[PDB]
């Protein structure tokens, strides 16, 4: 495998390992916050994907606001967060559903 700091790799057949969770620790960092968020409203445009599967179901969401990126989508079944840009643009995100007719 072409990669830095190591050129040895290998992959057997589908293993489906038990767990591969990570561990993140923080010591010090800065982050700027605007706290000047204004009225913003979006809507759903398209929806497609698989059933409850690997790639999931991708849903396109369109927003329109003056702030660069201030959004947090929360719903039952699955929670998805993403970043947007200034103005009106198109964004595609994926969620996890457990029903064929998603209504």
């Amino acid at each position: 495998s072409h990669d830095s700091l190591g050129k040895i790799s290998g992959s057997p057949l589908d293993i489906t390992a038990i767990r591969g969770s990570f561990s993140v620790n923080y010591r010090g960092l800065r982050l700027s916050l605007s706290e000047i968020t204004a009225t913003c409203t979006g809507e759903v445009t398209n929806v497609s994907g698989c059933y409850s599967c690997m790639t999931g179901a991708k849903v396109s969401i369109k927003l329109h606001s003056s702030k660069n990126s201030t959004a947090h989508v929360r719903c039952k079944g699955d929670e998805t967060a993403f970043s947007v840009l200034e103005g009106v643009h198109s964004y595609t995100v994926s969620l996890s559903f457990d029903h064929a007719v998603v209504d």
Partner: protein, 51 residues
């Protein structure tokens, strides 16, 4: 605290042992850095010393 009178300092020529440099520090040419990196380093330093 104060500069007291000294007879040995009347000649105007003082030896090198009367000069003390507090701490061992050396300098070198530097390179300007952006303010974001400096602020991040300051935040990390103030987080590493909470007392």
């Amino acid at each position: 605290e104060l500069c007291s009178s000294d007879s040995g300092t009347s000649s105007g020529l003082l030896p090198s042992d009367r000069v003390l440099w507090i701490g061992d520090v050396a300098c070198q040419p530097m390179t300007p850095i952006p303010e974001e990196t400096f602020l991040e380093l300051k935040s990390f330093s103030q987080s590493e010393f909470p007392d």
